[PDB]
Every structure is written in structure tokens, then in C-alpha cells.
Amino acid sequence: APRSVDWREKGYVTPVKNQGQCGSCWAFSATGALEGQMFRKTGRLISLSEQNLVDCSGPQGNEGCNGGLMDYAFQYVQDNGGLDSEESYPYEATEESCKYNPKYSVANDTGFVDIPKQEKALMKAVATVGPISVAIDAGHESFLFYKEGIYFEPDCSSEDMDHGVLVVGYGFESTSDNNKYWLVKNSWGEEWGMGGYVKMAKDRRNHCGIASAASYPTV
Numbered sequence: 001a002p003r004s005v006d007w008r009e010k011g012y013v014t015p016v017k018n019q020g021q022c023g024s025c026w027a028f029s030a031t032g033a034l035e036g037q038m039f040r041k042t043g044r045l046i047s048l049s050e051q052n053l054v055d056c057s058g059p060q061g062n063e064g065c066n067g068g069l070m071d072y073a074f075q076y077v078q079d080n081g082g083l084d085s086e087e088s089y090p091y092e093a094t095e096e097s098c099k100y101n102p103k104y105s106v107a108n109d110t111g112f113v114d115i116p117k118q119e120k121a122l123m124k125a126v127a128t129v130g131p132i133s134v135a136i137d138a139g140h141e142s143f144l145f146y147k148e149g150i151y152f153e154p155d156c157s158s159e160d161m162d163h164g165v166l167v168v169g170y171g172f173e174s175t176s177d178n179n180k181y182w183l184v185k186n187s188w189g190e191e192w193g194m195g196g197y198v199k200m201a202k203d204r205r206n207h208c209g210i211a212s213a214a215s216y217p218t219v
């Protein structure tokens with residue numbers, strides 16, 4: 001694998017979005033990963049509808065603004081035979097009746113891959129696939145108020161994750177002793193972290209569980 005990867009540079013990643021007060025992180029993580037895979041397939045970067053996922057993926061196990069799983073989202077897209085664009089089905093930050101319209105479907109998937117639960121495996125996937133959906137322990141105030149640099153939280157759990165985000169690359173700071181990171185796109189808007197991104201500690205015993213529940217859709 002390369003020493004550093006950043007899929008934003010290659011056109012795989014849409015601008016940072018903002019889930020608001022709805023517990024829809026899982027939907028943003030899932031659209032992120034699917035946006036990347038669709039871009040690889042077609043060469044077209046098209047923002048996808050989180051609202052479509054929030055409103056419609058109940059049968060697959062998702063619970064709207066009260067939480068969900070990226071894999072349940074990928075299963076929905078496969079079951080449903082499509083997913084609408086952001087433009088056609090805009091984000092409301094509240095759970096509403098399903099308004100899926102197949103005329104405006106711009107993405108599909110044929111299942112998903114769960115990555116082995118090691119950072120080495122995660123690195124190989126990011127290098128070869130594109131952006132990857134991941135679960136992290138975001139349940140510390142240090143994360144909420146993160147601004148810049150490599151995020152390390154001594155109390156982070158590698159087993160107990162509560163927030164779905166998107167790994168878009170990895171790399172290292174040229175500064176000192178702990179300098180590797182995962183480049184992670186959050187869904188809390190551009191004013192959180194580094195333009196909506198966080199550089200998370202990499203190769204430090206699966207910090208915050210970043211490799212514990214990593215997956216992406218097949219297209």
C-alpha cells in the first residue's frame with residue numbers, strides 16, 4: 001500500500017455535509033462510501049440522498065433519526081434497486097414517510113464487504129477500494145471539541161463504537177513520535193474539526209475501534 005492515500009484528491013468525495021440534530025450518521029457514512037464506489041464505476045460524482053435512507057430503510061433494520069448501520073443501508077439500496085440523488089430527495093433532518101422515486105435513482109449496489117477487524121486490513125482496503133464506512137467511539141467530549149491535529153483519546157474503546165463516519169485516506173505528519181493517521185470525513189458540517197475532517201490516530205491498537213466495523217458497498 002502507498003505511504004499516504006487521499007481519495008479527495010482523485011474526485012471520489014463530496015463536500016462535507018451536516019446531519020443536524022438527527023441521529024443519521026450511519027446514513028452519511030453509507031452515502032459517502034456509495035458516492036465513492038459509484039464514482040469509481042462511472043466517473044461521475046453525484047451527492048446521494050441520506051433522507052431516502054432515513055425514511056425508507058426500516059425493513060432492513062435502520063431506526064431513522066435514532067440510529068442505524070451502514071450495512072443495513074447498503075442492503076436497502078440492493079433490495080430497493082436504487083437510491084435517489086440528494087437533489088431529488090433533499091435532507092430534512094427528521095424522519096418522514098418514504099418518498100423514494102425510481103425515476104431519480106442514481107446509485108445501486110449489489111451487496112457489501114465487511115473488512116477484517118485489523119488496521120492493516122483497513123489500510124489495504126482504503127488503498128485499493130476508495131472511501132470506507134467505519135464505526136468509531138466518538139463518545140468523548142475531546143471528539144466533540146476536536147479542532148486540529150491527530151486525535152488521540154486514551155479512554156477510547158476499540159470495541160464500543162457509537163458513530164458512523166468515512167475514511168477517505170491515511171498518511172503521516174512530517175513534524176513527531178506518533179505521526180500516522182486516518183483521514184476521516186465527519187457529518188457535523190465544515191465548522192467542526194479541520195473543515196469537517198478529523199485526523200484520527202493510526203496504528204495505535206485500533207484506536208477508537210476504527211477497524212472494528214469497516215465496510216463498503218459493491219457496485
Ligand SMILES: *C(=N)C1(NC(=O)[C@@H]2C[C@@H](S(O)(O)c3ccc(OC)cc3Cl)CN2C(=O)C2(c3ccc(Cl)cn3)CNC2)CC1
Binds near residue numbers: 070071213
Ligand atoms: C449517529 N448519528 C448515531 N450513531 C449510530 O447510529 C451508530 C452508527 C453505527 S456504528 O457505526 O456506531 C456501529 C457500531 C457497532 C457495530 O458493530 C458492532 C457496527 C457499527 Cl456500523 C451503529 N450506531 C448506533 O448508535 C447503534 C445502533 C445500531 C443499529 C441500529 Cl438499527 C440503531 N443504533 C447503537 N448501538 C449501535 C448517534 C445515532
